[PDB]
Amino acid sequence: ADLEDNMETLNDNLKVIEKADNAAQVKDALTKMAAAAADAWSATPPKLEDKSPDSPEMHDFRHGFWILIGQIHAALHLANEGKVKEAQAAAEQLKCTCNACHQKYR
Amino acid sequence: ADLEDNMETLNDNLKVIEKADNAAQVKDALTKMAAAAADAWSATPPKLEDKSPDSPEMHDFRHGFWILIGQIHAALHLANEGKVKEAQAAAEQLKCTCNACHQKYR
Amino acid sequence: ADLEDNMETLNDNLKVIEKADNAAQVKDALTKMAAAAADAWSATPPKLEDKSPDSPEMHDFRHGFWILIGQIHAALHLANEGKVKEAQAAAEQLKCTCNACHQKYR
Amino acid sequence: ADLEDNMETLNDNLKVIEKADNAAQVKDALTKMAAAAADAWSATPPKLEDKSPDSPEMHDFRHGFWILIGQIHAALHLANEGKVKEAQAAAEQLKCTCNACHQKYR
Ligand code: HEC
Ligand code: HEC
Ligand code: HEC
Ligand code: HEC
Ligand SMILES: [Co+2]
Ligand SMILES: [Co+2]
Ligand SMILES: [Co+2]
């Protein structure tokens, strides 16, 4: 999917996680975030189009998704074992990763 | 120093970094925040003084300073590279982690 | 490429790095290793193939490539700074992470 | 405690974890490792004695304990859950962090 749609998927499912009651909903929302992040890994953002696909900026772009994916993965571990509030607090910290990439590249 | 002094250190040195002119000034303030974060790591915040030190809430509290310290290290690494403005942007992003802990435990 | 071929790309490029004489060779090789690692991410290894894709085992498998990719990125960071010796030593240390996953899933 | 005594604690408790047989054993050994890495953070290694305490080298040194403490804390999360196999696998991957710092600064 394109970068914009993966970003909507990330945004929509963070909202799902915030308002969720129960493990299964959080787990499904995180699984979809992980898939959208993995898909977005390979995109070139509008503001880096004139940069070489191996420039530091493009490396650091992919590095932001690497951080995000690890955080999603860890939240998924918590959700998978029923720790819903812990998973939600993990999701609130990973918002900071969204913000840091957005400040540099959005 | 106690937890309240550490937080004032963190807060004050965010302002120092924002208005700094050169890499040495950023590096010194970040060093002070790394020390105040490492010191707060072992504190018990008032809202958790009725939980056990070996409790999921205290482990999360401690984990929060570990996150903050890694982000402070990343910003120092930029300062050690002479990248003043980048280190300053990274110091600004710390606020998201400050807030994420405060939401839970302040 | 399949997992086999990703694994063989990782093996070959470690040698490339080991015998490299400039930063551009090391960067190149580390970039191909990052690529193959990301490709190996989504694979299912034989020894887990009668296992649920949601199992702790398959989560751990994926986590192992997340670890590897992070170390490769750190080695790339050093290569971008022209630190051929540091980047080579970091590359050589990747073998511990290679070996650690092999011990579990091979 | 001195750096040697902390490394002895780290080393001895790795071995206990590899040969442990109940949860509390792993948890207690990890808890001790957590403490020893915390203490060691603030030390100066012999090969870095004639370097500025705020040089990149001493910063990288401290950062290596930051990585190690993070990994110990994730292993401890598993142990505190009853996931002892898990946690022992996490223990094996920590060795790579030991080795990487040793190669550089021991
Ligand atoms: C990141 C850089 C920051 C900054 C700038 C601040 N904090 Fe914290 N903080 C935490 C707790 C539990 C408290 C309550 C302390 C108490 O009531 O005793 C605070 C408080 C503060 C303050 C107010 C201090 C006061 O005297 O009332 C300020 C100005 C402040 N902080 C700044 C806990 C945490 C964290 C736990 C993991 C983290 C991380 C931060 N705070 C981060 C920051
Ligand atoms: C990870 C779990 C480990 C383990 C099991 C050990 N270390 Fe370290 N280590 C570091 C340095 C600078 C030294 C030399 C200290 C000196 O010269 O005084 C060591 C040494 C050791 C030893 C040998 C102790 C002896 O006196 O012979 C042992 C058994 C040992 N270590 C175990 C530095 C670091 C780190 C810095 C970031 C990290 C992390 C580790 N070591 C990790 C571990
Ligand atoms: C880089 C490493 C990023 C991370 C991590 C996250 N986002 Fe992002 N996002 C990024 C870019 C470069 C852009 C601009 C894309 C474009 O085509 O202009 C975006 C955009 C968004 C948007 C707006 C999408 C749109 O319709 O234009 C949203 C809603 C968004 N991102 C959300 C989001 C969330 C919730 C994230 C963490 C969970 C996140 N993004 C991470 C780059 C990066
Ligand atoms: C798990 C997270 C792994 C990491 C990290 C690395 N490897 Fe790997 N490797 C893994 C598996 C499950 C296998 C078995 C593949 C199979 O289909 O049986 C392998 C295999 C290899 C091989 C042999 C290739 C072959 O066709 O048999 C090699 C040379 C190899 N692996 C090397 C290697 C290197 C150099 C790595 C990192 C730099 C590395 N592996 C990481 C799982 C995982
Ligand atoms: Co579209
Ligand atoms: Co492929
Ligand atoms: Co768990």
Side-chain angles (χ1 to χ4, degrees):
Chain A
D2 57 59
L3 185 52
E4 274 190 15
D5 292 343
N6 288 323
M7 288 301 166
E8 277 319 314
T9 300
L10 287 166
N11 195 50
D12 288 344
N13 280 285
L14 261 180
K15 289 179 194 155
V16 170
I17 289 158
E18 274 160 44
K19 303 143 154 173
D21 279 348
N22 59 96
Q25 162 162 225
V26 168
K27 176 186 169 39
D28 178 62
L30 283 163
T31 302
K32 298 171 175 178
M33 303 187 58
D39 197 32
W41 169 285
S42 64
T44 293
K47 280 168 148 144
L48 301 185
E49 287 199 18
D50 64 342
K51 295 294 181 123
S52 179
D54 295 331
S55 63
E57 316 77 8
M58 289 294 306
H59 175 240
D60 186 60
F61 187 66
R62 286 180 296 264
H63 191 67
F65 281 116
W66 175 84
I67 302 153
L68 191 76
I69 287 165
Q71 282 173 323
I72 292 169
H73 183 102
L76 200 41
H77 168 88
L78 296 166
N80 276 357
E81 58 196 7
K83 282 163 181 204
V84 173
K85 281 166 82 33
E86 305 98 305
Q88 285 165 312
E92 190 69 29
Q93 180 65 42
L94 73 88
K95 266 169 193 213
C96 300
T97 306
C98 317
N99 297 349
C101 183
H102 288 163
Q103 267 315 297
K104 282 142 55 153
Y105 301 121
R106 191 181 165 164
Chain B
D2 62 5
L3 184 62
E4 289 203 53
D5 285 23
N6 293 334
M7 297 298 158
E8 307 299 329
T9 299
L10 292 172
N11 201 47
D12 291 339
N13 278 280
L14 270 187
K15 167 260 293 112
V16 167
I17 292 161
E18 191 183 34
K19 309 203 182 228
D21 296 298
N22 57 66
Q25 303 171 288
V26 168
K27 170 165 172 187
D28 166 267
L30 285 170
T31 299
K32 297 161 181 206
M33 323 174 66
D39 185 22
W41 200 331
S42 50
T44 308
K47 299 207 178 328
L48 298 175
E49 46 185 58
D50 286 337
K51 295 262 172 263
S52 182
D54 184 6
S55 67
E57 292 79 19
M58 304 290 305
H59 294 296
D60 189 46
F61 186 78
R62 292 187 282 266
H63 185 66
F65 287 109
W66 180 88
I67 295 168
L68 188 77
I69 288 166
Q71 286 169 317
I72 290 167
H73 281 194
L76 293 173
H77 181 105
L78 290 161
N80 282 338
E81 288 178 348
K83 310 182 172 143
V84 189
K85 182 73 269 313
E86 291 183 45
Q88 278 173 310
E92 271 302 299
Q93 292 297 136
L94 296 171
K95 280 159 175 176
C96 184
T97 295
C98 310
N99 294 151
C101 175
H102 292 164
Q103 279 312 90
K104 292 185 286 183
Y105 302 127
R106 169 156 74 166
Chain C
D2 52 47
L3 180 59
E4 293 86 316
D5 271 315
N6 290 328
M7 286 310 151
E8 155 187 327
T9 299
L10 294 166
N11 206 25
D12 295 348
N13 276 280
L14 273 180
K15 304 190 207 132
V16 170
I17 288 154
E18 174 212 296
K19 310 198 271 273
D21 302 301
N22 59 60
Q25 312 171 298
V26 176
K27 295 182 235 173
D28 186 274
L30 287 168
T31 300
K32 297 168 165 144
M33 276 170 86
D39 198 333
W41 280 344
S42 57
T44 302
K47 186 68 71 174
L48 291 176
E49 206 181 17
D50 303 1
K51 197 80 57 162
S52 168
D54 181 354
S55 50
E57 290 92 340
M58 287 282 317
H59 280 274
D60 184 59
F61 184 79
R62 281 180 306 256
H63 186 56
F65 285 109
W66 182 88
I67 295 179
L68 185 72
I69 288 167
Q71 300 173 294
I72 293 162
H73 284 194
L76 262 179
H77 176 100
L78 292 167
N80 289 338
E81 304 176 335
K83 282 158 190 293
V84 309
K85 298 200 183 319
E86 288 86 322
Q88 286 175 309
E92 205 53 16
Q93 291 293 145
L94 294 172
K95 268 159 181 173
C96 187
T97 300
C98 315
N99 293 348
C101 176
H102 296 160
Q103 277 304 300
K104 295 178 298 182
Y105 300 123
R106 198 178 172 203
Chain D
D2 66 38
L3 186 57
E4 293 190 341
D5 292 332
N6 287 319
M7 295 299 154
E8 155 167 48
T9 312
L10 287 172
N11 196 54
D12 292 345
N13 280 287
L14 268 175
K15 285 165 179 343
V16 169
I17 286 152
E18 318 187 322
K19 292 159 187 191
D21 196 355
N22 50 74
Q25 261 162 9
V26 177
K27 183 188 175 141
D28 179 89
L30 286 173
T31 300
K32 295 166 163 163
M33 310 180 71
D39 185 354
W41 189 310
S42 78
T44 301
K47 291 182 186 294
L48 284 195
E49 264 184 350
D50 275 336
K51 289 295 245 128
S52 167
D54 286 316
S55 50
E57 286 86 18
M58 290 285 308
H59 182 233
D60 193 50
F61 183 72
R62 284 185 290 271
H63 189 257
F65 287 108
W66 178 85
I67 289 167
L68 192 79
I69 285 155
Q71 297 182 297
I72 291 166
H73 279 158
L76 198 47
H77 167 92
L78 292 167
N80 292 352
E81 285 186 321
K83 312 191 162 175
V84 176
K85 296 279 154 173
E86 290 78 359
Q88 304 183 319
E92 271 305 291
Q93 181 62 230
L94 298 84
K95 297 197 201 179
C96 306
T97 300
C98 316
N99 298 335
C101 178
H102 291 165
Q103 190 264 8
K104 267 183 289 193
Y105 305 132
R106 163 146 75 75

